[PDB]
Amino acid sequence: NNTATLCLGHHAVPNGTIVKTITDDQIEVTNATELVQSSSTGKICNNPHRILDGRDCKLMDALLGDPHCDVFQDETWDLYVERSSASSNCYPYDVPDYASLRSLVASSGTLEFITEGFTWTGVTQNGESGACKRGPANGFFSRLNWLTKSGSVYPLLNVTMPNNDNFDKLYVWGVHHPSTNQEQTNLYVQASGRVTVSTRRSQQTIIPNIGSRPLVRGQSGRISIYWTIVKPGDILMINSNGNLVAPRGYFKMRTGKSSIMRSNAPIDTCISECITPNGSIPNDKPFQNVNKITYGACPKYVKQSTLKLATGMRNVPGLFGAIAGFIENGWEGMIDGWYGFRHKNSEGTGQAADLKSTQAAIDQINGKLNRVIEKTNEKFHQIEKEFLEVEGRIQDLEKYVEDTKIDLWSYNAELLVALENQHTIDLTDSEMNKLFEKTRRQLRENAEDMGNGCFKIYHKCDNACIESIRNGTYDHDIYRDEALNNRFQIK
Amino acid sequence: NNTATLCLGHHAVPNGTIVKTITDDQIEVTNATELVQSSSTGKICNNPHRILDGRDCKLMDALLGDPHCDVFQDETWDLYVERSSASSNCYPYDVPDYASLRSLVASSGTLEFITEGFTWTGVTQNGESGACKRGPANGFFSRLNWLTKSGSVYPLLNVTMPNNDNFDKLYVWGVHHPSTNQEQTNLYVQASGRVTVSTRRSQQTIIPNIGSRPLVRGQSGRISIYWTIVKPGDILMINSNGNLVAPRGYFKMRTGKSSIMRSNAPIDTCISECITPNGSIPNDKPFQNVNKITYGACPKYVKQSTLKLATGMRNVPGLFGAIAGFIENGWEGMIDGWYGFRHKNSEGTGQAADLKSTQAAIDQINGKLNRVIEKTNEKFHQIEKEFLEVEGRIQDLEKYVEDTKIDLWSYNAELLVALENQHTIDLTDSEMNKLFEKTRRQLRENAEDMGNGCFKIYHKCDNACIESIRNGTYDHDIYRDEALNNRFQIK
Amino acid sequence: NNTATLCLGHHAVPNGTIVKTITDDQIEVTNATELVQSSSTGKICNNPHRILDGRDCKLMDALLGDPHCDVFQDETWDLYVERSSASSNCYPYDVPDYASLRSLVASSGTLEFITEGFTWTGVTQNGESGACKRGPANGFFSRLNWLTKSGSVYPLLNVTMPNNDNFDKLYVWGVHHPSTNQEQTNLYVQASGRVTVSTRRSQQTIIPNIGSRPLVRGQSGRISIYWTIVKPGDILMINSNGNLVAPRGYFKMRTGKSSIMRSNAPIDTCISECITPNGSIPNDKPFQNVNKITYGACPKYVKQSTLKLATGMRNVPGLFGAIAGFIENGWEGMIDGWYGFRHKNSEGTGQAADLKSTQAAIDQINGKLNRVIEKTNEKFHQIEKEFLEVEGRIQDLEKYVEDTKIDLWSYNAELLVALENQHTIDLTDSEMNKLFEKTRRQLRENAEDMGNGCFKIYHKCDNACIESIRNGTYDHDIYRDEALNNRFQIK
Ligand SMILES: *[C@@H]1O[C@H](CO)[C@@H](O[C@@H]2O[C@H](CO)[C@@H](O[C@@H]3O[C@H](CO)[C@@H](O)[C@H](O)[C@@H]3O)[C@H](O)[C@H]2NC(C)=O)[C@H](O)[C@H]1NC(C)=O
Ligand SMILES: *[C@@H]1O[C@H](CO)[C@@H](O[C@@H]2O[C@H](CO)[C@@H](O)[C@H](O)[C@H]2NC(C)=O)[C@H](O)[C@H]1NC(C)=O
Ligand SMILES: *[C@@H]1O[C@H](CO)[C@@H](O[C@@H]2O[C@H](CO)[C@@H](O)[C@H](O)[C@H]2NC(C)=O)[C@H](O)[C@H]1NC(C)=O
Numbered sequence A, B, C: 001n002n003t004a005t006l007c008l009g010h011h012a013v014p015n016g017t018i019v020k021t022i023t024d025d026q027i028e029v030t031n032a033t034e035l036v037q038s039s040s041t042g043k044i045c046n047n048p049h050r051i052l053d054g055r056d057c058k059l060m061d062a063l064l065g066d067p068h069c070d071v072f073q074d075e076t077w078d079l080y081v082e083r084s085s086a087s088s089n090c091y092p093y094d095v096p097d098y099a100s101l102r103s104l105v106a107s108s109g110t111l112e113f114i115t116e117g118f119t120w121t122g123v124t125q126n127g128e129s130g131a132c133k134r135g136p137a138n139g140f141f142s143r144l145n146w147l148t149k150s151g152s153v154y155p156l157l158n159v160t161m162p163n164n165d166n167f168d169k170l171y172v173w174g175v176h177h178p179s180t181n182q183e184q185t186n187l188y189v190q191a192s193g194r195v196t197v198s199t200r201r202s203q204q205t206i207i208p209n210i211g212s213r214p215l216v217r218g219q220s221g222r223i224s225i226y227w228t229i230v231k232p233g234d235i236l237m238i239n240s241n242g243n244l245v246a247p248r249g250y251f252k253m254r255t256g257k258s259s260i261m262r263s264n265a266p267i268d269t270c271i272s273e274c275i276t277p278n279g280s281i282p283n284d285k286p287f288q289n290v291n292k293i294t295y296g297a298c299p300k301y302v303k304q305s306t307l308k309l310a311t312g313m314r315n316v317p318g319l320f321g322a323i324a325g326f327i328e329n330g331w332e333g334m335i336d337g338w339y340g341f342r343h344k345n346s347e348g349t350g351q352a353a354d355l356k357s358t359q360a361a362i363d364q365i366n367g368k369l370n371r372v373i374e375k376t377n378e379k380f381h382q383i384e385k386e387f388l389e390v391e392g393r394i395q396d397l398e399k400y401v402e403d404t405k406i407d408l409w410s411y412n413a414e415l416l417v418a419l420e421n422q423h424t425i426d427l428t429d430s431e432m433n434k435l436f437e438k439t440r441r442q443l444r445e446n447a448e449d450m451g452n453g454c455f456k457i458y459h460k461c462d463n464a465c466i467e468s469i470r471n472g473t474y475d476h477d478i479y480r481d482e483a484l485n486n487r488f489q490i491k
């Protein structure tokens, strides 16, 4: 009963987590959290974004009005989902700069179509084809009007349609490419047709292409599709002496967050802000390894499959040399704090957590967690990142831009976790050392550092005395004479 | 009079500045500096870059030689400033790949035009139009030569111009699309014209299409503009049976720092390396939030409106636990240093700054300031970043490249400031602790740490004695007997 | 002989290395390593990548089968090396979108050519030209078939070639533009020809343009080159009434790591994963300043010519204030450790390295080295980064993408080295301090800190005694009474 021992320590856990730091690729901490989202349910949630399942309809075919796509008339979407099983079943066509028209319509997010009163004098309208059947009957794109000769004449068509509204109009039209010179003359009379579609400030002027091509649904001819945007106060003009596949009206254009995605994932009734072709994913983590293609408020795509952020101190079953240093060992029985005191005196032994030092470490770790885990990434219509055809220069560049981006963000994520982990380990070591130093300072000349995180207190120090040290009210003067006598033999 | 007190401390100010760190979203430091430039004067400075105000002339119209644009003949610029009020007033035209021609001329930075001795046998030159008046007279683009029939014949033109120089020549030429067959035959005799412009390494052939486009300044036809660059030792060949709008010569091409910007900001007499469409901005800060479009030595565009870099210690009106730790409190009355000493002795009280510790903290902070705010970003001709029309694929990519860039730099700036501030707080805490420890070591057995940054010195220690401690010359041996006697009663 | 001195210290070297940190642009460390590769041997190593030296053949000429390029028939490569001296020696031609065809063939990595059963009824095959000699005899591109009239007739050609395989076929074909009407008629009978090449999903119709171009190898006519990819289950059709330069079969298409590089560096026998136009470079460093154009597992291109990473402590011939702090001075005579002890006792003087602290510092530094210099960057076919012609919009974007990437990586590299160096200086300072503190703790009341990294041990401490302190088994209880006496005169 003439001396007491007061030992400082920190908690420990039976199963820790291995994390990476600046100096160690593998080091065990008490707790960590995963920063990379690597799983999806495999389904696209239908809220909060308006999802339109294209089913067997490509957006381009829903736009032109392929007969199997009539149910998509006037549809809207935040995200149009294009299925790989979708196919075209109308007159065979191509779209110079297909990707751009698909993109601009996808971004517009509506197929709202307004029929206009184009006057086509002196021609036969509403041409139909065995390539574009409605049941057994010949048919054609709903939004296009295939004009041919009337009697022995195809006149010079010259028509206008002013835009007197306050929104932009999108016109989609085509040019028919016959298989032979004979077909050219049979349909259009003139041996060389031409289609010129213009506004006051722009024009597209096209000549038909003649030649036999592989039969598609019985047809060797083809249509090429073009588009024209007409702004308020501007006007559409169409001038043709043959081969014109006319528009029936315009699509309203909108701006907003709409886009299109290629996916075969089923749609489900649930809520998720982030969508990938693999399905919706949670956005609670800052990074994800599910797909570079995303839509909505999403974690950033990185190459890593896991990045673990330490959320507790080193686990011992640092710059300051306290944790895993002069303190040999963590305490598994300390579950109400991160740091604390054990003591041994006349009245027995005991353990108490230190609230203030525990809270300081927790507050600092929560601070970095809040910084890191803060959702900051919301992107909608972007660039394409997977490609079905070889194209060369433009595709090389699109791929390189995305690859460059991913490599830079993977770098940021890797560094972030290594630096943060090194600092977490160092600040928790720091808090342990600061509590030790504060205790040392309280004790003045009445105790000695045993070298293992323990003080030998050279006087009788009962439970209330120990509590005075723990709560920062120890009065060293009260015990000094006793202590100096015991330490040094002074009186 | 037999003991003294020596206290260590650091300065503080009544009102500090809130900054962000890795672990704290809000923490008060003594001083900080702003890293984001958020303001402009609203004017473009006319030095040091050569600014050319386009006024009511688009670069394309100054190039072709629209009659309202004669003052721009042979102009040069580092930055051509294009105003939104600019309009065209000549024959209605379009430029396939308009953006590319505008870009390459802008980047070249000169409209220096060299008239060449082209021979046009058998045609009428200098065609003119009511759409392009010069005063009361019909006129045409100054740099183009509208060729028409002579008598009842328009011959096959076949002309050459070798490049015997050692620089590239830019030729700008056009093809006329008449409104009607009557106009075509009246001008060119041939029912269908053709233009082929070739060199040894390239060829461009355009077959115009006849048809009405909207009436513009009385004209329903259009001219389409094309260009050809002829390398040293190569040869221009022009071949046409009608519809050629011929060049009169070539434009000189240069490489350098020239570009073009769309802005409605007025030009002013002043100096500024950095120009934005909003006006010039200072470049003393590393980041800016004014505009992603810039020219010259500019701060990097980021999303943040403010980023405060700590340039002083924590303000108390750290890893080491001195500042805001065992030192309870900063000293507002300490104004000639950052760290220092106060004492109470036989002669009274006093205060003195510690120069070495003050200077060490200041040098380290100036070090990071020099590193951070060092101007290292100078960009001239870049890509466009705002767009007046919907285009689809290439524009999607241009937008994505820029958004990607901005998000990465915004990340770098945010991390930089958080890391630097955390480190600044820690290094200033460190310097305080090191000064305390140095003082403790000098005192040996002659003093005890009171636990609050103060030492009780256990001997008579007058002003000279205190100064010996402050200046690092204290001789502990001189006072050891006296001190040990007071502490322990040894005598 | 009643006391001993034990001094702690660290090594130093006479000439250290100057590095940069967060706080100092220049600070000397004992050792550093260069992170930027700035040199090449100037030769391209022929392993492990399959390098194909194009010699005087551009890939495009090797593809078409220019007579000087016959040795490249059916070649394959990982990297095609294109020389600046390469020239074309066949009929003059141009390739609309040349860069894309060059890119896609380069990326495919093979010229494997399969002859197919095209039947050309009623025409003369194997046309040849004096512009395209094989020795003294006229010749033509080996992979193309120049068809001309047979007798007095050139009939409408109409042929098909199904893709019944499970791979993609690349067809390369051409259209002849005669110089004169006389030539057109002599070769093809029809006054105006036409070439239509199609599949089920695509079509191209090219109309030849008759007219003079500048003479190249005796020819004022030109051939234009086009290509068509035919997927499994699709069908190629070719339909023409003149001017067709027919394919003889297809090139097999592959995907993989192949690319093309412009370089004049010789190829030699050696091994190198990374190739630049300057020659191969080692990939042991994470960064390089040799060339932005690279192929293989390469360091990342940065703007800096040098970046030195500290791999040793501060050199003295920190946050903790030990190194270049209370320890005045490093020890050059310490060659078997980074930290250690010198002593002075009755038996003389001595020195010993401390293994554990030395190893702790080394292990931490090796940890960051392994992290930093870990080869993680491997790129194959990318985008072009140097250009011979002005092009405008697409080239502006390619350049901007590459410049953006480089500035971001240069930033990352600069920050990495500054941060790592600051931390290395601090952790080595920490390790010195930790050793000092551990020693202090062992000695208890038996020694005093002299303030300069040395302990005065206040008792007889022979060689065995010193060694017990160095190996951590010192028993302070044995000497405590003797020590307190010398210290205060208490025993
Ligand atoms: C100065 O610092 C450099 C960089 O750390 C030291 O060079 C490094 O030395 C180590 C040990 O010799 C090398 O590690 C070894 O690498 C080989 C692979 O070749 C491996 O088989 C060994 O088991 C060991 O891992 C390391 O490669 C080498 N690095 C470089 C860039 O040379 C150098 O030793 C230091 N000098 C002094 C005097 O401390
Ligand atoms: C281990 O670390 C995780 C990460 O912080 C802790 O989980 C957090 O707990 C707090 C408090 O309940 C919640 O507010 C957060 O939402 C949780 N975050 C996550 C990502 O789940 C967890 O509590 C820690 N475990 C222990 C035993 O401390
Ligand atoms: C040009 O060649 C094609 C291919 O041989 C011919 O098209 C075939 O015609 C038959 C009946 O007319 C169809 O059953 C085949 O399916 C067609 N094949 C393809 C690939 O389309 C075409 O008739 C020929 N044209 C001329 C004018 O002879």
Ligand SMILES: *[C@@H]1O[C@H](CO)[C@@H](O[C@@H]2O[C@H](CO)[C@@H](O)[C@H](O)[C@H]2NC(C)=O)[C@H](O)[C@H]1NC(C)=O
Residues within 6 Å of the ligand: A158, A159, A160, A235, B180, B212, B213, B214, B215
């Ligand atoms: C083709 O149609 C356009 C549009 O109706 C005609 O252009 C109009 O012509 C009248 C008479 O000159 C003008 O008053 C209008 O301003 C014109 N409108 C536009 C939009 O240009 C054009 O004349 C017709 N062309 C032919 C050959 O009949």
Ligand SMILES: *[C@@H]1O[C@H](CO)[C@@H](O[C@@H]2O[C@H](CO)[C@@H](O)[C@H](O)[C@H]2NC(C)=O)[C@H](O)[C@H]1NC(C)=O
Residues within 6 Å of the ligand: B158, B159, B160, B235, C212, C213, C214, C215, C220
């Ligand atoms: C068009 O003009 C060019 C230039 O004079 C002619 O090409 C030259 O023809 C002569 C002999 O006919 C050659 O010796 C020259 O080398 C050619 N020059 C070039 C640059 O090719 C061309 O023949 C003319 N074409 C017509 C149809 O008259």
Ligand SMILES: *[C@@H]1O[C@H](CO)[C@@H](O)[C@H](O)[C@H]1NC(C)=O
Residues within 6 Å of the ligand: A038, A039, A040, A277, A278, A289, A290, A291
């Ligand atoms: C997502 O789909 C892609 C292919 O579309 C696949 O490579 C990837 O492994 C998938 N990820 C998950 C988590 O299923």
Ligand SMILES: *[C@@H]1O[C@H](CO)[C@@H](O)[C@H](O)[C@H]1NC(C)=O
Residues within 6 Å of the ligand: B031, B032, B033, B311, B369
């Ligand atoms: C605050 O920091 C800035 C940046 O170094 C400096 O210019 C200014 O003088 C500082 N103010 C004080 C009072 O130190």
Ligand SMILES: *[C@@H]1O[C@H](CO)[C@@H](O)[C@H](O)[C@H]1NC(C)=O
Residues within 6 Å of the ligand: B038, B039, B040, B277, B278, B289, B290, B291
């Ligand atoms: C600069 O101009 C843009 C308009 O493009 C505007 O959005 C921004 O608020 C302006 N900033 C300042 C500081 O004037």
Ligand SMILES: *[C@@H]1O[C@H](CO)[C@@H](O)[C@H](O)[C@H]1NC(C)=O
Residues within 6 Å of the ligand: C038, C039, C040, C277, C278, C289, C290, C291
């Ligand atoms: C590599 O080549 C480039 C381009 O030719 C040149 O600018 C650079 O100086 C070269 N570098 C070395 C190290 O040879």
